């Protein structure tokens, strides 16, 4: 009865410890939670001002498809500050969220059969965006000579998670160029750009200034804690932009009105106060969560970003899993689930209050020794 | 270097004269929209308090994918009461607005090769979501004779929308009743529902109560002036809506939070108070459009519902509306964007304030005589 597309949609390997973590909880049990994929902070004061004046001014009716003009100046503006790349406001489109944005973005240009080169580990939800559309999601290390040996002729493009969710790691420059001189499409999400602890914002604008070749997707979930309001963004060329018009003003019409205007406050001077202490505040703690990794003989590489540590713990990540969460109620994310790479392996999320994190680990450390 | 499906999907006819409305707009000339689809009320007001509240109180992360289990619940007890039909809360889910419900509905049961019954004339962006899917749009007269004729092997279901954009009537009994009989998936579009100025409201869940085969949509945006703020929700039985939660898992998340907890708010005394001084707004005006409309000859067949009358002109509206516009500063929407069978049409919206409508209505008559 349920169609064909719907039947290959594959299900996420932490609905069992989701459950499991309920139970325990209902029990009276303290479950700490480390598979957060959300931050723990509150919009910045700023933003909800802002958007409780725009209720109280009727601030209800839909938008313009593309996203109001102001927005998305501002956001224009700020590439024009961060990066030395100018863009038009008619190059960038408001949607409900970054999720729908990247669902978009692959829409307008994957036909069937196509091939499009993931990373292995990477978000869940990319292989079913491709598979949904027809298309074979191609896992690959990010490197220079495995991308090399998975091009074919079917190979439409690529998706540059950077940093990374489950690695946390930063995406090197020569992956990059290798793409854009190889891959007739770059999809860079960069949806946790701004949450890098060491180093500098890499983004694709960077080696594509026209926007030739690639749809950048972002949005105000991460970095601004705007997960709830559901608003985000894509930027390319006219031709794809306009493409994207088309998918939005039929299946979505427009981001929700009152985050629009809220958002418009992201760029005040207070609200970048309230961020950069939200970023020291997340380093504080991705620190700690490295000394112990070190500590419990753990093997990483780099994590600079987003808010997760996908360390090798040289076993099966899904049983350990299982185990540490019923003995001591610690709730981690199984690495199987982001790709075959990552068997042994688990994702860590310190997206969760400083002291919580401290017990969490303590708790592990009595659960190795 | 376009996807194929972004190729087929056809564009509304109405940007043509939108611009033009604009051009006008700037002149200086005060243009009178009767082109508007969606109501011109500002959300009620226990709803607007119940967002700037919970703005207040943080409510900013995401929410369970199914939606909060509050506002199901009261959803739920709504059917319970208007219509003696029992729903399980599990059997809902809230979505970001009806668009992507319906998005989500046709996904879940669609395999290429399919046709799926449509009316002519019918909303414009069921047969982009159709051809999107691999599925093709077959138009039809709504009567018992030709839904028998249009039925074949390859038929997988039926959208009703009533009362239905653009024709403003209300489907009667019977197609439904042949629909359960004969077709093995009913999608019923419910948007509009409450907006109904004779007669009672009828929903599928009366035909088919244990939701065997129907997916049925209804959402906050028209009967509660919730547009901007993107909600709307799902019924149908369990294996559909495990399926469109995979769907919403992925592409979407959640519906935004603060419109969720607002909407708790739809369902008070207070609340129904104001959209039942709506309604009969909406009817006073719906009146004198009618009466203009047999003045000026055309023809019209019962329209009811929403805020929408789609009389035959006797000729081409496409012409009809250009012209108009031009020289009275009238907008209108040409009948042949919802269907061939609307050459000879024109929607007529009076989603307006009364005055604009009366104004608007004495001009295009100064434009017939």
Do not use: H, M, Q, R
């Given at each position: 009865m349920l169609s064909k597309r719907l039947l290959n949609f594959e299900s996420f390997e932490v609905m069992d410890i989701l459950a499991l973590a309920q139970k325990l909880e209902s029990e009276g049990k303290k479950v700490i939670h480390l598979?957060?994929?959300?931050?723990?902070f509150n919009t910045p004061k700023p933003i909800v001002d802002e958007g409780i004046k725009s209720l109280k001014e009727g601030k209800t009716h839909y938008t313009d498809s593309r996203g109001i003009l102001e927005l998305r100046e501002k956001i224009s503006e700020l590439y024009k500050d961060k990066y030395k790349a100018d863009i038009i406001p008619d190059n960038i489109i408001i949607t409900g969220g970054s999720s729908l944005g990247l669902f978009f973005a692959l829409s307008s240009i994957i036909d069937d059969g196509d091939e499009v080169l993931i990373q292995?580990?990477?978000?869940?939800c990319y292989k079913n965006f491709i598979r949904f559309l027809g298309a074979k999601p191609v896992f690959c290390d990010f490197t220079v000579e495995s991308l090399e040996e998975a091009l074919?002729?079917?190979?439409k493009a690529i998706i540059i998670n950077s940093?990374?969710?489950?690695?946390?790691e930063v995406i090197d420059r020569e992956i990059y160029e290798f793409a854009y001189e190889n891959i007739p499409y770059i999809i860079s999400?960069?949806?946790?750009?701004?949450?890098?602890?060491?180093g500098k914002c890499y983004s694709a604008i960077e080696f594509d200034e026209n926007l030739e070749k690639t749809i950048l997707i972002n949005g105000f979930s991460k970095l601004y804690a705007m997960?709830?309001?559901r608003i985000g963004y894509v930027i390319s060329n006219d031709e794809i932009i306009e493409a994207i018009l088309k998918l939005q003003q039929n299946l979505?019409?427009?981001?929700?009105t009152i985050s629009q205007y809220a958002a418009l406050?992201?760029?005040e001077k207070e609200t970048e106060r309230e961020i950069n202490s939200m970023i020291k505040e997340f380093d504080r703690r991705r620190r700690l969560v490295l000394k112990y990794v070190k500590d419990f003989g753990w093997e990483v590489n780099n994590?600079?970003?987003?808010?997760y540590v996908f360390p090798n713990?040289?076993?099966?990540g899904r049983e350990f899993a299982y185990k540490l969460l019923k003995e001591k109620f610690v709730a981690l994310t199984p690495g199987i689930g982001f790709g075959?790479?990552?068997?042994n392996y688990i994702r860590i999320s310190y997206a969760n209050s400083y002291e919580n994190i401290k017990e969490g680990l303590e708790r592990i450390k009595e659960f190795l020794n």
């Open positions: 598979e957060i994929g959300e931050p723990d292995n580990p990477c978000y869940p074919s002729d079917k190979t940093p990374s969710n489950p690695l946390g999400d960069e949806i946790y750009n701004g949450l890098v602890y060491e997960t709830g309001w979505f019409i427009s981001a929700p406050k992201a760029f994590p600079i970003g987003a808010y713990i040289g076993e099966d075959s790479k990552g068997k």
